Design a protein around this motif. Structure first.
Motif, PDB file in Angstrom:
ATOM      1  N   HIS C 253      25.409  46.434  19.453  1.00  0.00           N
ATOM      2  CA  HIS C 253      25.144  45.214  19.276  1.00  0.00           C
ATOM      3  C   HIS C 253      24.898  44.388  20.503  1.00  0.00           C
ATOM      4  O   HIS C 253      24.342  43.407  20.538  1.00  0.00           O
ATOM      5  CB  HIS C 253      26.585  44.601  19.013  1.00  0.00           C
ATOM      6  CG  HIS C 253      26.980  44.923  17.501  1.00  0.00           C
ATOM      7  ND1 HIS C 253      26.863  44.054  16.604  1.00  0.00           N
ATOM      8  CD2 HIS C 253      27.930  46.016  17.010  1.00  0.00           C
ATOM      9  CE1 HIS C 253      27.208  44.515  15.563  1.00  0.00           C
ATOM     10  NE2 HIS C 253      27.852  45.923  15.545  1.00  0.00           N
ATOM     11  N   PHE C 254      25.037  45.201  21.752  1.00  0.00           N
ATOM     12  CA  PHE C 254      24.756  44.806  22.901  1.00  0.00           C
ATOM     13  C   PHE C 254      23.575  45.765  23.677  1.00  0.00           C
ATOM     14  O   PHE C 254      24.284  46.745  24.273  1.00  0.00           O
ATOM     15  CB  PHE C 254      25.781  44.312  23.909  1.00  0.00           C
ATOM     16  CG  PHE C 254      26.987  43.439  23.337  1.00  0.00           C
ATOM     17  CD1 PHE C 254      26.460  42.068  23.344  1.00  0.00           C
ATOM     18  CD2 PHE C 254      27.973  43.833  22.833  1.00  0.00           C
ATOM     19  CE1 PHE C 254      27.486  41.060  22.878  1.00  0.00           C
ATOM     20  CE2 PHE C 254      28.998  42.968  22.296  1.00  0.00           C
ATOM     21  CZ  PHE C 254      28.532  41.613  22.290  1.00  0.00           C
ATOM     22  N   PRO C 255      22.260  45.901  23.215  1.00  0.00           N
ATOM     23  CA  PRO C 255      21.589  46.829  24.004  1.00  0.00           C
ATOM     24  C   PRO C 255      21.540  46.780  25.572  1.00  0.00           C
ATOM     25  O   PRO C 255      21.108  47.988  26.322  1.00  0.00           O
ATOM     26  CB  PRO C 255      20.317  46.323  23.499  1.00  0.00           C
ATOM     27  CG  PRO C 255      20.485  45.042  22.972  1.00  0.00           C
ATOM     28  CD  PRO C 255      21.842  44.913  22.573  1.00  0.00           C
ATOM     29  N   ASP C 256      21.558  45.629  26.067  1.00  0.00           N
ATOM     30  CA  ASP C 256      21.580  45.423  27.727  1.00  0.00           C
ATOM     31  C   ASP C 256      22.784  45.715  28.329  1.00  0.00           C
ATOM     32  O   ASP C 256      22.963  45.838  29.526  1.00  0.00           O
ATOM     33  CB  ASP C 256      21.373  43.894  27.731  1.00  0.00           C
ATOM     34  CG  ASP C 256      22.059  42.805  27.221  1.00  0.00           C
ATOM     35  OD1 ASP C 256      22.698  42.967  26.096  1.00  0.00           O
ATOM     36  OD2 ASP C 256      22.615  41.905  28.046  1.00  0.00           O
ATOM     37  N   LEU C 257      23.947  46.016  27.682  1.00  0.00           N
ATOM     38  CA  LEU C 257      25.168  46.033  28.048  1.00  0.00           C
ATOM     39  C   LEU C 257      25.120  47.609  28.805  1.00  0.00           C
ATOM     40  O   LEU C 257      24.654  48.548  28.079  1.00  0.00           O
ATOM     41  CB  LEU C 257      26.253  46.101  27.163  1.00  0.00           C
ATOM     42  CG  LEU C 257      27.846  46.479  27.870  1.00  0.00           C
ATOM     43  CD1 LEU C 257      27.995  45.373  28.698  1.00  0.00           C
ATOM     44  CD2 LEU C 257      28.698  46.124  26.503  1.00  0.00           C
ATOM     45  N   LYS C 258      25.556  47.765  30.006  1.00  0.00           N
ATOM     46  CA  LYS C 258      25.789  49.022  30.556  1.00  0.00           C
ATOM     47  C   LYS C 258      27.255  49.567  30.795  1.00  0.00           C
ATOM     48  O   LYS C 258      27.943  48.851  31.504  1.00  0.00           O
ATOM     49  CB  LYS C 258      25.019  49.042  32.111  1.00  0.00           C
ATOM     50  CG  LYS C 258      23.556  48.791  31.967  1.00  0.00           C
ATOM     51  CD  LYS C 258      23.071  48.272  33.411  1.00  0.00           C
ATOM     52  CE  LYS C 258      23.867  47.051  33.993  1.00  0.00           C
ATOM     53  NZ  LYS C 258      23.484  46.862  35.377  1.00  0.00           N
ATOM     54  N   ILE C 259      27.461  50.810  30.045  1.00  0.00           N
ATOM     55  CA  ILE C 259      28.665  51.252  29.949  1.00  0.00           C
ATOM     56  C   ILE C 259      28.854  52.695  30.552  1.00  0.00           C
ATOM     57  O   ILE C 259      27.995  53.549  30.116  1.00  0.00           O
ATOM     58  CB  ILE C 259      29.072  51.415  28.420  1.00  0.00           C
ATOM     59  CG1 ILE C 259      29.117  49.916  27.659  1.00  0.00           C
ATOM     60  CG2 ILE C 259      30.400  52.109  28.076  1.00  0.00           C
ATOM     61  CD1 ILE C 259      29.656  49.815  26.327  1.00  0.00           C
ATOM     62  N   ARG C 260      29.727  52.817  31.488  1.00  0.00           N
ATOM     63  CA  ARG C 260      30.059  54.243  31.964  1.00  0.00           C
ATOM     64  C   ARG C 260      31.346  54.603  31.252  1.00  0.00           C
ATOM     65  O   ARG C 260      32.311  54.112  31.364  1.00  0.00           O
ATOM     66  CB  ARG C 260      30.172  54.090  33.332  1.00  0.00           C
ATOM     67  CG  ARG C 260      30.649  55.320  34.027  1.00  0.00           C
ATOM     68  CD  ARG C 260      31.013  55.415  35.521  1.00  0.00           C
ATOM     69  NE  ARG C 260      29.952  54.628  36.660  1.00  0.00           N
ATOM     70  CZ  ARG C 260      30.015  54.339  37.686  1.00  0.00           C
ATOM     71  NH1 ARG C 260      31.196  54.679  38.395  1.00  0.00           N
ATOM     72  NH2 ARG C 260      28.962  53.830  38.196  1.00  0.00           N
ATOM     73  N   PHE C 261      31.281  56.002  30.945  1.00  0.00           N
ATOM     74  CA  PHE C 261      32.044  56.737  30.049  1.00  0.00           C
ATOM     75  C   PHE C 261      32.817  57.704  30.936  1.00  0.00           C
ATOM     76  O   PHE C 261      32.112  58.723  31.496  1.00  0.00           O
ATOM     77  CB  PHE C 261      31.834  57.057  28.714  1.00  0.00           C
ATOM     78  CG  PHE C 261      32.827  57.480  27.886  1.00  0.00           C
ATOM     79  CD1 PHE C 261      33.438  56.814  26.849  1.00  0.00           C
ATOM     80  CD2 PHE C 261      33.521  58.793  27.978  1.00  0.00           C
ATOM     81  CE1 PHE C 261      34.603  56.966  26.189  1.00  0.00           C
ATOM     82  CE2 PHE C 261      34.536  59.302  27.095  1.00  0.00           C
ATOM     83  CZ  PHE C 261      35.128  58.136  26.221  1.00  0.00           C
ATOM     84  N   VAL C 262      34.137  57.554  31.312  1.00  0.00           N
ATOM     85  CA  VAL C 262      34.878  58.479  32.024  1.00  0.00           C
ATOM     86  C   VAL C 262      35.950  59.220  31.201  1.00  0.00           C
ATOM     87  O   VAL C 262      36.781  58.559  30.392  1.00  0.00           O
ATOM     88  CB  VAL C 262      35.506  57.803  33.167  1.00  0.00           C
ATOM     89  CG1 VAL C 262      36.322  58.959  34.031  1.00  0.00           C
ATOM     90  CG2 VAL C 262      34.368  57.198  33.990  1.00  0.00           C
ATOM     91  N   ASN C 263      36.128  60.320  31.282  1.00  0.00           N
ATOM     92  CA  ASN C 263      37.223  61.200  30.464  1.00  0.00           C
ATOM     93  C   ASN C 263      38.136  61.785  31.526  1.00  0.00           C
ATOM     94  O   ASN C 263      37.507  62.451  32.445  1.00  0.00           O
ATOM     95  CB  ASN C 263      36.557  62.288  29.630  1.00  0.00           C
ATOM     96  CG  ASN C 263      37.792  62.781  28.565  1.00  0.00           C
ATOM     97  OD1 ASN C 263      38.169  62.124  27.711  1.00  0.00           O
ATOM     98  ND2 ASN C 263      37.959  64.000  29.028  1.00  0.00           N
TER      99      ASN C 263
END
Ligand SMILES: Cc1ncc(C[n+]2csc(CCOP(=O)(O)OP(=O)(O)O)c2C)c(N)n1
Ligand SMILES: Cc1ncc(C[n+]2csc(CCOP(=O)(O)OP(=O)(O)O)c2C)c(N)n1
Ligand SMILES: [Mg+2]
Ligand SMILES: [Mg+2]
Lengths: 788, 788, 397
Positions: C253-263
């Motif tokens: 839904h937000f192509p411009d959003l930048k998400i960093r995933f940390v586990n």
């Protein structure tokens, strides 16, 4: 030999009657020393005396006789109390029967429990003076006078074997609601319903005046109660030996006629309106108490009400008179050493569930069964394009109510003040008709849907009409009320009474089971100005409901038919709320699909995506609407602004559940601060368009961060006669006035929109001038629809 | 002829047994078509299967026999369930008896109600798989295995005529709490209490393994039950015709011995501990279900647990086998056309309140009477000067509990695991002694307080001891638990089990009446390091209680004896909470008067005016203490700072109710933001001195505005052996460490207080060196008292 | 693929290679936890009467390396086994971990004194506890109100004696089990879920992940070479799937959003370097979780435990934890996540609120997500099971 009374059991009946009065005086006055083992001292007396004595002898007199009739004929009674301040009489009888000890184990049948029983009455952290939800075997609060008889009929609306005895005070009969409620015998159906036995306590005096019905002649009184349709029976005198025989005989006379009427109706041989039995009591007020105290008559006069003696602690002479008053009942023989009633009183008490204070009808939540609701998506209208298809919103609701009636033929009824036909709700007339039980002509057969059997009651007096519903819900059944908004001030007093019962029952009382919800449908809003109703309709009923807490009342303003069905479907499932639904009779646009209406009513507040101008960007203004007429104007204002300002970004929000605006701190049902800030932006102006008084929105949304940017347009005043468009102009809720307001609040439109603001003012003047010349709005105003 | 059975009534018993199993499978599997009028289709089967079947035949087998025995002997039973997953068996019997229909009117005894009854089980928005509070006639949740037997004894602790039948699974018997709980027969008093009949369901298999007690020899199993003190009876086989006669005979054999034991005890002729009856069942697990399904034995094996067949929707063959399983019960004869049970089943059902699923003991809130307690101000110590008079805090509590015992000789008991004498609570030994019911010697008479009649339970296994109290409260009585803090991790699992019961009963279930509160007293805190208990005591029990919601648990840390009495008095009135009270046995200072303690516990947290330095001015630092040992250190730190810094202004706050720190949004009990800001100022540093883990304070006060200025000192770690002063130094909760901390936080003392901070570090080193040489603290440390 | 089977095979291989100094302990849940791979070479020890019905169904013999008994108290076998000098492994449900609450504190007391105070005590093997069938799945066995509170009480003890591992998938589970069998003076608590789940890490990538303990997942991360708008962190395995599903919705839904995933696998890495040398340094923590961007932590267990560990961090005020709060009587796996607000939709809602430039743009999407929450709950009430696309979800990028 039921009418005749044996002398041996008469003493036991008198023993019960004495014990009830002894406990009645004890809880009014005594704080300690319940059995008077030691001589009375001022520290045993309550400091402040708020109890009422005038009605106590009469209620205890009737109650003990009714227990005798239950023992013989195996009946079931409820004993809704009229005066409402005779709660000491009810609580004493409940304690004697053992019901109160079972409900409240602290007030055990013992000397210690008797001390606790007297202590708790009329005390902080204790039971109240009137008959409250804490009182076992009570459905009528009784504090407000005039609604007792309607509650008697409502409790017997669909219980065939139930018998209810309502005691009516002569002063209470002066009230308007009680004067009409006598005629409710006609609407009652003897074939499938119970019998109501009204008793008139014509003691002759009010708190300070002789009563009107006691100062009329016996012939006039008999003429008056014949006209109401009741069979009048008169019991007079002040001698207990005479009164025990006469009143037992009259009760046996009436109940056999009640059984004869019910048997004849169910057999079908006598299908006509019968003269119901009724009992009139001329016993003096407080005729078992002191006669003269301070040189004035305190028995059978207005001085007998709630104050036998003004001061007890100050004057030891009155305390001695008080002690002699308690000695007159001879309490030593009535109770044993432990304080429990003697075996003579135990034997004559009803056994098990037959006790009137322990009847499950009074605690109707146990008797309540969940309603069988057909899916409303079957009756929902189909909308290919939102805002472009026009259909009346009353017809889908009428079909939905018809389906509920068929699926729930016993525990559901519909109430209307001769407006069901006016409200275009004739869909329910297909399967069931209105109940009249009167003479009929062939002209009525073609015109009105009238029959002996029916599920819809129609009487103009909303006092008795709403009183029927309140008892119907407290009995455990389900109902629905539909009326105009203009006459909602009539039931203003009654709604507060019912909301008081639900509020105490939910929190304070733990053994009260939840009852069904109170669903009121308000139609013919102030904006349309229909032919019926006064010219200056007032939407102020919404405001007084909001004065009560958000945890007992819910207000819904669905915009279209599909949203109306979802609200009606959801509210028929709720239990401990008062649901006020404000819809409009006139044909309107439709904005929501059957599936989309369900999602909308689930949230209560939602952004309309099709009406919203720009998504993915911060809106310049948030346009909000609450009602249905004002929703059309809010939508029409959006069309004008999007036409003249293509770059303008408008978010459209429609609210259905009003109390969602309240913060989460005030109630868990209200929206959280983050949820509210998502709907209504933290900084952009909000143009709220509210059906009703514009200040109500500010009350709810006061604690919000963005309250200062909230602007509400709503009902202010109404002219003598106006067109639907012209009325919105005067209240500044019109499409042009809203569009003007948006131009003012938006910072970058105050300069660019000057030309458009001038054009809108021309449209306001042009439509008003056309209204004065023709008397009707322009065709494009009436036939407007969403252009996008 | 009670032991023998007529053939005709055996068929009716078998008919009831078949109907219970038919309803059991129906709610596990069927979602629609309850009576199988049409052939079974996959849409009638639940998509997700979570119900348990392995224990269902056994529970239904015992239940129908108990209803047979309750008809003839007119007994009263509770039927506490051990496996806990046999709830379908209980709900089926409750529905058959009509109890479930009365409690839940939606699940009416009809075809439509049967569809609703099957639908709701193991479903979202429905009754759970285990025995929940929604289950009528249930006090034991049963989800945790091993606590059922203790709940059987607790429910019969003061009901003489009550009989309790607890079913024990063989896999459950491996658990530690259940193994000890067998010895609870000795503590039970046959003269004044009821009889508990334990039944062992030795089906032979767990979910995946053979059970331990089934794989021992019959001789060794009989030896084991003799050692526990029970008279063992064995019922074996898998033939219903044989099993009906044998099990009915064994039940009749046991109950007459139970009546013989109770009659002999009340007559006083046999004052000795008898061998209570015990029943062993060797019936195979799921012996009424399918035998082989997928080439493996699914009857009488570990595969029978909770899964007869894994897949039904995927494999139509299993659905056909499932349909044949339902046909094996012949449901056509058991139910009529309407769906109600036939007249054969109705006659054999118990009538009225005698129904095992409708006993008022299970819903003990109705049976509960308010506790009569004396004023605690009689037993409160007298303090002329706060903080200067030294007295032990346990003795006032012991006297107060003694007075409650005399005033409440029936509905109150005290529980202590070998520490009632250790906790200096010997004041209750004056009037009543602990119950032992065993052989006694004259040495025991002089030393211990033991007698057949008693109100104090003494057994150091905290498992079985805490299990007795939980059932005692759910029965409607009142109790009090006193133990060490070091062994509070033992009852950690049990507290969560009881907390979830009260949480569901308060909110979800409406017919559950409130029960008495759970009061636990924790003594011998970690700071004193008493002789008993391990060296590394852990105050972590306070933290796990706070994991449960603040609306079900309350934690109180009273500083002195008077504040302890007010907490104990207040908690004995509360109903739906778990009250954890932490006090110390060792003699301490006294800070509050009898009247001032009541005001302190009313607010929960309040400023101590005498300890506070300056009033009418903004304090420089707020010194807060929560426990009692740390309160002395917090006071001693205040004395040092006021001695060395005369201009310093110190506000002293003592916190008793821990959950008051939570914001008003989290719970209405917590302090509001304005109230919290008045106690602890919005900007000045707060030096909190907390008994227990220091982070618990940060969890509660996280949402507060002044959380960043909150500094907590508390328990971190403990050495092998330390003096009370040196232990505080290690955890930095000592008077000198606290005074050092105040100097750091206060902005204007970081430079002026450098000399004083150096002096305090000398005092820390000086006391540690003296501790190593002597092994005891300096005399002025132990005999410290408030100097102002 | 189910994550229990690879662990069972690995445990079987250890048994054959170490036939004497290794044993396995389980309270009648080894077969329940789908650990039947060890039953191939060795069987449970019973030493009692046996029937042919037991032979076909159960694996029982006089000689065995697997102990099975209902009472978790008689964990006491394992503690002495490690102090003897040998090695063991404990596998049980998480719901009944409060039973061994007292015993664990006793053993951790012994190890802490032996490590520091006593010098002649030689190091012994580590205590390895495997907790299966977490509170989110709500299996048929166990009470309906499961409590993950056992993780909290372990953290009350010092980080120098207890280690808590929450591996997301099967490969990360094997690396944790392999690494913990080498450690000596620690109590290792491993929380894995029995039910079949997705797989996120390769055999080589799992080893690198468990080496660091906490690390960025590059495939799940939206944009590299740019500052992320939000950091989405997950700790458990069920909540990891919801955290990944929330990432898929936001990226859709937000192509411009930048998400960093940390586990996060090793919980105590969150503690600062001052508290323990094992914890991440301030610079290392600031690299993983940015110093200013909001952190949406999705933690298995009580949400406050994360705040205890990461309290001293600079970016603690920007840390938002969603976790276990309360459980209904009976719920679907998705419905239970909705109640605790750890569902994919609730996480996506929380990202919209926290990100400064999505509070206005994301209003339409936030409205759409609330529709999905209501729609799935309504379907759950009608059918009793989640929608097929919920159960069969998989990473779309
Ligand atoms: C409409 C209304 N008017 C006045 C009152 C005040 N009021 C309460 S009780 C009472 C006495 C009238 O009672 P009555 O019907 O004469 O009963 P009785 O004493 O015969 O039992 C009055 C005037 C009221 N509650 N409601
Ligand atoms: C201490 C503990 N360990 C494990 C479980 C898991 N569990 C739930 S029910 C059950 C079966 C109990 O077996 P048994 O007592 O033989 O019962 P029945 O055969 O009648 O089902 C088990 C092991 C539990 N509830 N508690
Ligand atoms: Mg009057
Ligand atoms: Mg078993």
């Amino acid at each position: 030999d039921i009418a005749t009374l044996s002398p041996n059991e008469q003493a036991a009946i008198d023993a019960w009657w004495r014990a009830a009065n002894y406990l009645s005086v004890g809880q009014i006055y005594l704080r300690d020393n319940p059995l008077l083992q030691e001589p009375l001292r001022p520290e045993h007396i309550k400091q402040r005396l708020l109890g009422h004595w005038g009605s106590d002898p009469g209620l205890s007199f009737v109650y003990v006789h009714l227990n005798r009739l239950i023992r013989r004929l195996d009946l079931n009674l409820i004993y809704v109390t009229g005066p409402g301040h005779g709660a000491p009489a009810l609580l004493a009888n409940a304690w004697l029967e053992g019901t109160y000890s079972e409900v409240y184990p602290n007030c055990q049948q013992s000397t210690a429990g008797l001390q606790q029983f007297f202590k708790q009455f009329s005390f902080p952290g204790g039971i109240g003076s009137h008959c409250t939800p804490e009182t076992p075997g009570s459905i009528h609060e009784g504090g407000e006078l005039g609604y007792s008889l309607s509650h008697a009929f409502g409790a017997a609306l669909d219980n065939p074997d139930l018998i209810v005895a309502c005691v009516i005070g002569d002063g209470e009969a002066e009230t308007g609601p009680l004067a009409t409620s006598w005629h409710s015998n006609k609407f009652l159906n003897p074939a499938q319903d119970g019998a109501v036995l009204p008793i008139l306590h014509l003691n002759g005096y009010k708190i300070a005046n002789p009563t009107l019905l006691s100062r009329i002649s016996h012939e006039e009184l008999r003429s008056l109660f014949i006209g109401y349709g009741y069979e009048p029976f008169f019991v007079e005198g002040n001698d207990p030996a005479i009164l025990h025989g006469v009143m037992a005989s009259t009760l046996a006379t009436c109940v056999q006629k009640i059984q004869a009427i019910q048997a004849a109706a169910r057999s079908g041989e006598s299908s006509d309106r019968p003269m119901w039995p009724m009992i009139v009591l001329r016993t003096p007020k407080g005729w078992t108490g002191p006669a003269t105290i301070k040189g004035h008559v305190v028995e059978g006069s207005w001085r007998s009400h709630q104050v036998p003696m003004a001061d007890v602690l100050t004057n030891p002479e009155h305390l001695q008179l008080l002690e002699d008053w308690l000695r007159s009942y001879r309490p030593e023989e009535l109770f044993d050493a432990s304080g429990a009633p003697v075996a003579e009183l135990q034997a004559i008490a009803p056994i098990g569930d037959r006790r009137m204070s322990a009847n499950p009808v009074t605690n109707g939540g146990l008797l309540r069964r969940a309603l069988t609701l057909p899916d409303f998506r079957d009756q929902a209208v189909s909308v290919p394009a939102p805002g472009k298809s026009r259909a009346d919103s009353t017809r889908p609701l009428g079909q939905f109510l018809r389906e509920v009636i068929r699926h729930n033929p016993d525990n559901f009824r519909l109430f209307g003040p001769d407006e069901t036909a006016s409200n275009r709700l004739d869909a329910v007339y297909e399967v069931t008709s209105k109940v009249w039980l009167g003479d009929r002509i062939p002209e009525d057969e073609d015109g009105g849907h009238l029959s002996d059997r029916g599920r819809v009651m129609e009487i103009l007096s909303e006092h008795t009409l709403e009183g029927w519903l309140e008892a119907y819900l407290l009995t455990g059944r389900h109902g629905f009320f539909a009326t105009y908004e203009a006459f909602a001030h009539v039931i203003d007093s009654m709604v507060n009474q019912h909301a008081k019962w639900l509020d105490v029952s939910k929190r304070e009382v733990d053994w009260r089971a939840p009852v069904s919800s109170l669903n009121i449908l308000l139609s013919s809003t102030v904006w349309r100005q229909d032919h019926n109703g006064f010219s200056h309709q007032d939407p102020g009923f919404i405001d007084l409901v909001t004065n009560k807490s958000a945890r007992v009342t819910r207000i819904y303003l669905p915009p279209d038919a599909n949203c109306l069905l979802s609200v009606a479907d959801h509210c028929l499932r709720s239990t401990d709320y008062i649901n006020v639904i404000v819809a409009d009779k006139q044909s309107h646009l439709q904005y929501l699909d059957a599936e989309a209406a369900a999602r909308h009513c689930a949230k209560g507040i939602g952004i309309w995506d099709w009406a919203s101008n720009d998504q993915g960007a911060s809106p310049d203004v948030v346009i909000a609407s609450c009602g249905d007429v004002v929703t059309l104007e809010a939508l029409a204002a959006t069309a004008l602004l999007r036409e003249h300002f293509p770059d303008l970004k408008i978010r459209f929000v429609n609210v259905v559940d009003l109390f969602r605006l309240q913060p989460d701190t005030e109630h868990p049902h209200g929206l959280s601060d983050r949820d509210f800030d998502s709907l209504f932006t933290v900084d952009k102006p909000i143009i709220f368009n509210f059906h009703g008084y514009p200040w109500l929105i500010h009350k709810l949304a006061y604690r919000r961060h963005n309250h200062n940017n909230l602007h509400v347009r709503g009902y202010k005043e109404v002219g003598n006669i106006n067109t639907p468009l012209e009325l919105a102009i005067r209240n500044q809720v019109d499409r042009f006035n809203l569009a003007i307001d948006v131009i003012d609040r938006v910072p970058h439109l105050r300069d660019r929109g000057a030309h458009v603001k001038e054009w809108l003012k021309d449209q306001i003047h042009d439509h008003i001038q056309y209204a004065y010349q023709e008397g009707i709005d322009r065709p494009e105003i009436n036939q407007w629809q969403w252009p996008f």
